[PDB]
């Protein structure tokens with residue numbers, strides 16, 4: 001079961017790569033609600049800019065904006081600088097399509 005970019009079909013992740021709960025409903029400072037699925041691994045993304053800790057939803061992690069490497073759609077964030085695990089992907093579920 002493969003996760004693709006909803007806009008262009010870019011290969012992003014797999015159900016097998018979900019990181020357990022795997023679903024987190026969060027809000028950013030602009031009040032936008034994101035239903036975020038955590039993945040151990042993802043591909044086909046472009047990480048833009050430098051990591052930031054500001055308003056991180058996950059204690060001990062910095063985020064980098066993750067675009068679809070193909071169409072540039074915002075699919076979520078790469079998280080790093082934490083412990084167990086050091087890195088993971090928080091992807092916006094409704095911006096993916098499952099096979």
Ligand SMILES: COc1ccccc1C1=NO[C@@]2(CCC(=O)NC2=O)C1
Pocket residue numbers: 027028029030054055056057058063077
């Ligand atoms: C309007 O947005 C911002 C403006 C300024 C600084 C940060 C943000 C952010 N929006 O969403 C983020 C995504 C990563 C995260 O874990 N938490 C968030 O809240 C970061």
Ligand SMILES: [Zn+2]
Pocket residue numbers: 005006007008009010068069070071072073
């Ligand atoms: Zn795309």
